[PDB]
């Protein structure tokens, strides 16, 4: 039923988006508001295939009434996951601070935990001083370059046919900009590599005798035995990436 | 020793603990390999690029066999079956579709190139600062107090091994901002005053090494009235 | 709106971010810079203030003999901040431009559905119930070709904006790592003057 | 529309990636430390007011 004060000379009704949301009765004198039928998106939450075969279903942006019991979250309706009381690290993110995990074994939804609580004592005249150290080594991985490609418009858009090539001339020069952009990218890749790696003006050589005060650098220096002359870590990195 | 002196630790700390530091470094270098060996997700960034490229190319090829609102996706059949004056429409539709696909691919590659270049610039800056020198910026070259770094190569990327220093085995102590003696205040040159319960010493701020208090380690600079919390104790001359 | 478009909620709520900020504030208040490179070590606040003063080239007796004056100046400077933020109308303009642009793009995308692009009508049902299939195919093809370009343009604009947002996020993360977790010597990186705290 | 090619899956993929990156940005920025420190019950930091 209509709630707005319809002016007694109009028939239809529209909104900011210009969509019909009011129709005058053809047989009586009344206006009816039209609302779209409920719809939403469906998401599937599953662990690895070779660990189980159960799943959970999330209906996005809808209440559970419009559809291991049901559950209502700020992101929508969850079916197939059992709510718990604890809090762990997030395993499969779902929505506003709600995660799901696999743990008999079932699928449990919970609230993620930020971290372990701590409270350092503070006072007006106290200090803490360390008495020992630890040497730590960590890794950082960064991409530097990309694959360099080139294309041919005539061979791609048309095959060996000549009618297609003749008709292609009516489109102007829409096939010379592409080559320019691809060539620019290809040159930029080499520029990136040269900027990153070419930092030394001379090639240095390590002394044949390797005794650096007790330190051992054998795992990072090049290995003469291998034909490629690469360190074991470099060889492992090259083998790991396909 | 020079690198140790660059973070606030004297050289005698290293010179009297050479074997322990060397053993720790060797153990860490030996253990670093298994971290890369397992958890293959670690080299995700170096792999996605490859995958992405392949995917893109595949899609483009798979876009060739599409009707695009025409009778057939093969030029020869369109030419043979329909007379040339009408086949122009179908040929034009196919041309427009393929041109759109090529433009989309080119634009996507152009967008990706900028992110790749930004990553390369960051890597170049890291190589300039962490490797060829020592860095004071926090959490830039590792996690902790930076000592050194080592580069390695990888398919379409670089790997940095950061060697840093971390304190451990802390202990509680009582401190005072200054020391009162003969009506004069004394402040530490470098370090901090610490009391073990009965006596008072002056130490560094990153390694417990107490020393007796002497006018060599302190400067007077003022009187014994303005400062709040000043305690009084004798000073060896 | 809401005829094919959905807005997803962020993974982190508005309270977890506040908890993270409170943890950072407590760590930098009760531990100095030591909590960002190892175990947190306690230290009285005036002593770490003396350390920070020494870090810029001023001896400790300058602070230790001027504690109350510095505390009063800091209190007044902190107090004026709320009035400075409230009085200035367009202070948080950068955070409002994001919302404005994200609303404008969606509004334009929604409004684009009322364009004929060349056809008898811009409504599918009328075309289907009014004409024969041979012409309905042409009309539907025209409408599809009209809408696909709008979708592609929206996607491209979103990608271009996301790149800049990511760059700003990287800058903010670097600033949090450098200015907050420790002192800085880079000029004008953290404020105007000789950096003390953040 | 079915016979217009795979012009829609590659539209969903970009938006999904954008959403993932947007969710990752906040974790990169705020989630630095993994311990939740708390202030002492009594607040007197040498006269400074926080
Ligand atoms: C500082 O830490 C080092 C390393 O943990 C300690 O050296 C260890 O001492 C124990 C006790 O005999 C040995 O079992 C270990 O083998 C030593 N580690 C190494 C790598 O050799 C050292 O004792 C600590 N010093 C202080 C003062 O706490
Ligand atoms: C430096 O480290 C390497 C790597 O561990 C040492 O090489 C090891 O040598 C022992 C001695 O026979 C072998 O049992 C190991 O298998 C070797 N490791 C590897 C990975 O092959 C090398 O000996 C160390 N340098 C010194 C001077 O001891
Ligand atoms: C820190 O500053 C706040 C803000 O001025 C102080 O809170 C004020 O306290 C006085 C005295 O009780 C009240 O009259 C004001 O109304 C308070 N202000 C507000 C905004 O509530 C607080 O007392 C200060 N801290 C200390 C230790 O004095
Ligand atoms: C439950 O669904 C109805 C739809 O009929 C909706 O109006 C209501 O807001 C939903 N409940 C909650 C708590 O959102
Ligand atoms: C915790 O458990 C109680 C039952 O003891 C339940 O009522 C409550 O909803 C649970 N809270 C959460 C957050 O799971
Ligand atoms: C430390 O000294 C100040 C100075 O008055 C005092 O307010 C505070 O309560 C003292 N700390 C404790 C734990 O008593
Ligand atoms: C220092 O004292 C606090 C409380 O007084 C205590 O929790 C902490 O463990 C002490 N530190 C050490 C190294 O024992
Ligand atoms: C404190 O240091 C003095 C200095 O000689 C020493 O005599 C005393 O035994 C020490 N006490 C403790 C508990 O370490
Ligand atoms: C030494 O300090 C104490 C306070 O701890 C004070 O009572 C005493 O008067 C001081 N000594 C002199 C000679 O003033």
Tab-separated table of N, CA and C in Angstrom, chain A residues 16-18 39 60 74-75 90 93-99 111-112 114 120-130, chain C residues 1-6 8-13 16 19-20 29-31 40-47 51 110 114:
chain	number	residue	atom	x	y	z
A	16	UNK	N	15.301	8.715	-7.429
A	16	UNK	CA	16.557	9.331	-7.852
A	16	UNK	C	17.184	8.539	-8.992
A	17	UNK	N	17.065	7.214	-8.950
A	17	UNK	CA	17.599	6.358	-10.001
A	17	UNK	C	16.672	6.244	-11.203
A	18	UNK	N	15.512	6.904	-11.168
A	18	UNK	CA	14.545	6.896	-12.266
A	18	UNK	C	14.056	5.475	-12.559
A	39	UNK	N	17.205	-10.676	-3.328
A	39	UNK	CA	18.263	-11.355	-4.058
A	39	UNK	C	19.587	-11.073	-3.366
A	60	UNK	N	24.996	-13.287	1.205
A	60	UNK	CA	25.503	-11.951	1.491
A	60	UNK	C	24.377	-10.925	1.480
A	74	UNK	N	27.065	-9.826	10.670
A	74	UNK	CA	26.947	-8.510	10.052
A	74	UNK	C	27.113	-8.568	8.540
A	75	UNK	N	27.738	-9.620	8.017
A	75	UNK	CA	27.898	-9.791	6.582
A	75	UNK	C	26.758	-10.570	5.936
A	90	UNK	N	42.885	-15.767	12.681
A	90	UNK	CA	41.982	-15.951	11.554
A	90	UNK	C	42.520	-17.008	10.597
A	93	UNK	N	38.898	-15.696	6.395
A	93	UNK	CA	38.125	-14.485	6.697
A	93	UNK	C	36.742	-14.535	6.064
A	94	UNK	N	35.764	-13.967	6.769
A	94	UNK	CA	34.382	-13.986	6.303
A	94	UNK	C	33.845	-12.567	6.185
A	95	UNK	N	33.815	-11.839	7.295
A	95	UNK	CA	33.209	-10.513	7.335
A	95	UNK	C	33.797	-9.651	8.418
A	96	UNK	N	32.933	-8.932	9.129
A	96	UNK	CA	33.353	-7.943	10.121
A	96	UNK	C	33.847	-8.658	11.371
A	97	UNK	N	35.124	-9.033	11.360
A	97	UNK	CA	35.728	-9.641	12.527
A	97	UNK	C	35.302	-11.064	12.799
A	98	UNK	N	34.801	-11.771	11.791
A	98	UNK	CA	34.343	-13.146	11.937
A	98	UNK	C	35.177	-14.024	11.015
A	99	UNK	N	35.748	-15.087	11.568
A	99	UNK	CA	36.541	-16.039	10.807
A	99	UNK	C	35.968	-17.438	10.985
A	111	UNK	N	35.221	-15.269	16.518
A	111	UNK	CA	35.735	-13.910	16.419
A	111	UNK	C	37.253	-13.953	16.528
A	112	UNK	N	37.932	-13.303	15.586
A	112	UNK	CA	39.385	-13.361	15.535
A	112	UNK	C	40.000	-12.694	16.761
A	114	UNK	N	43.192	-10.579	18.333
A	114	UNK	CA	44.242	-9.665	17.898
A	114	UNK	C	45.616	-10.144	18.352
A	120	UNK	N	53.277	-4.320	30.807
A	120	UNK	CA	54.607	-4.064	31.345
A	120	UNK	C	54.485	-3.154	32.559
A	121	UNK	N	55.152	-3.531	33.647
A	121	UNK	CA	55.102	-2.740	34.868
A	121	UNK	C	55.797	-1.400	34.670
A	122	UNK	N	55.176	-0.344	35.188
A	122	UNK	CA	55.711	1.004	35.100
A	122	UNK	C	55.782	1.614	36.491
A	123	UNK	N	56.891	2.290	36.776
A	123	UNK	CA	57.081	2.952	38.056
A	123	UNK	C	57.980	4.161	37.846
A	124	UNK	N	58.037	5.018	38.866
A	124	UNK	CA	58.731	6.291	38.717
A	124	UNK	C	60.249	6.132	38.725
A	125	UNK	N	60.772	5.068	39.333
A	125	UNK	CA	62.218	4.926	39.510
A	125	UNK	C	62.682	3.490	39.257
A	126	UNK	N	62.202	2.877	38.176
A	126	UNK	CA	62.629	1.532	37.808
A	126	UNK	C	63.004	1.483	36.334
A	127	UNK	N	63.996	0.646	36.015
A	127	UNK	CA	64.459	0.458	34.646
A	127	UNK	C	64.730	-1.023	34.411
A	128	UNK	N	64.794	-1.395	33.134
A	128	UNK	CA	65.135	-2.751	32.723
A	128	UNK	C	66.287	-2.690	31.734
A	129	UNK	N	67.326	-3.477	31.988
A	129	UNK	CA	68.517	-3.484	31.138
A	129	UNK	C	68.811	-4.913	30.697
A	130	UNK	N	69.078	-5.155	29.416
A	130	UNK	CA	69.384	-6.518	28.969
A	130	UNK	C	70.781	-6.950	29.386
C	1	UNK	N	19.142	1.996	-6.901
C	1	UNK	CA	20.401	1.288	-6.710
C	1	UNK	C	20.158	-0.146	-6.253
C	2	UNK	N	21.246	-0.844	-5.926
C	2	UNK	CA	21.188	-2.215	-5.417
C	2	UNK	C	20.441	-3.141	-6.374
C	3	UNK	N	20.732	-3.015	-7.666
C	3	UNK	CA	20.181	-3.888	-8.694
C	3	UNK	C	21.298	-4.630	-9.418
C	4	UNK	N	22.259	-5.142	-8.656
C	4	UNK	CA	23.394	-5.841	-9.225
C	4	UNK	C	24.700	-5.447	-8.568
C	5	UNK	N	24.646	-4.440	-7.701
C	5	UNK	CA	25.822	-3.889	-7.042
C	5	UNK	C	25.721	-4.128	-5.544
C	6	UNK	N	26.820	-4.573	-4.939
C	6	UNK	CA	26.872	-4.844	-3.511
C	6	UNK	C	28.128	-4.221	-2.920
C	8	UNK	N	30.818	-4.667	0.185
C	8	UNK	CA	31.225	-5.634	1.193
C	8	UNK	C	31.779	-4.931	2.429
C	9	UNK	N	31.634	-5.537	3.604
C	9	UNK	CA	32.142	-4.914	4.827
C	9	UNK	C	33.619	-5.207	5.014
C	10	UNK	N	34.351	-4.323	5.688
C	10	UNK	CA	35.772	-4.581	5.935
C	10	UNK	C	35.971	-5.713	6.928
C	11	UNK	N	37.120	-6.382	6.806
C	11	UNK	CA	37.420	-7.503	7.690
C	11	UNK	C	37.573	-7.047	9.135
C	12	UNK	N	38.230	-5.912	9.351
C	12	UNK	CA	38.466	-5.381	10.686
C	12	UNK	C	37.408	-4.337	11.016
C	13	UNK	N	36.812	-4.455	12.198
C	13	UNK	CA	35.774	-3.529	12.629
C	13	UNK	C	36.416	-2.221	13.089
C	16	UNK	N	38.624	-2.901	16.729
C	16	UNK	CA	39.932	-3.548	16.693
C	16	UNK	C	41.028	-2.553	16.331
C	19	UNK	N	41.750	-0.643	19.408
C	19	UNK	CA	42.560	-1.456	20.311
C	19	UNK	C	44.020	-1.475	19.877
C	20	UNK	N	44.266	-1.604	18.571
C	20	UNK	CA	45.634	-1.572	18.063
C	20	UNK	C	46.301	-0.237	18.371
C	29	UNK	N	54.434	4.843	25.321
C	29	UNK	CA	54.462	5.649	26.537
C	29	UNK	C	55.304	4.980	27.614
C	30	UNK	N	55.083	3.689	27.851
C	30	UNK	CA	55.714	3.010	28.975
C	30	UNK	C	57.016	2.302	28.615
C	31	UNK	N	57.446	2.342	27.353
C	31	UNK	CA	58.662	1.633	26.970
C	31	UNK	C	59.602	2.412	26.062
C	40	UNK	N	59.874	-5.500	25.463
C	40	UNK	CA	59.600	-4.169	25.985
C	40	UNK	C	60.288	-3.978	27.330
C	41	UNK	N	61.025	-2.878	27.463
C	41	UNK	CA	61.759	-2.558	28.679
C	41	UNK	C	61.211	-1.267	29.269
C	42	UNK	N	60.918	-1.291	30.566
C	42	UNK	CA	60.344	-0.131	31.229
C	42	UNK	C	61.390	0.962	31.424
C	43	UNK	N	60.914	2.201	31.501
C	43	UNK	CA	61.766	3.367	31.725
C	43	UNK	C	60.880	4.537	32.142
C	44	UNK	N	61.284	5.337	33.129
C	44	UNK	CA	60.494	6.521	33.481
C	44	UNK	C	60.416	7.501	32.321
C	45	UNK	N	59.268	8.169	32.216
C	45	UNK	CA	59.034	9.080	31.097
C	45	UNK	C	60.030	10.234	31.038
C	46	UNK	N	60.354	10.932	32.135
C	46	UNK	CA	61.374	11.989	32.032
C	46	UNK	C	62.720	11.484	31.548
C	47	UNK	N	63.090	10.246	31.880
C	47	UNK	CA	64.381	9.727	31.440
C	47	UNK	C	64.399	9.494	29.933
C	51	UNK	N	66.588	11.234	26.983
C	51	UNK	CA	67.213	10.524	25.870
C	51	UNK	C	66.864	11.184	24.541
C	110	UNK	N	24.854	3.667	-12.004
C	110	UNK	CA	23.426	3.383	-11.900
C	110	UNK	C	22.641	4.211	-12.912
C	114	UNK	N	19.663	4.227	-17.932
C	114	UNK	CA	18.516	4.877	-18.563
C	114	UNK	C	18.891	5.544	-19.879
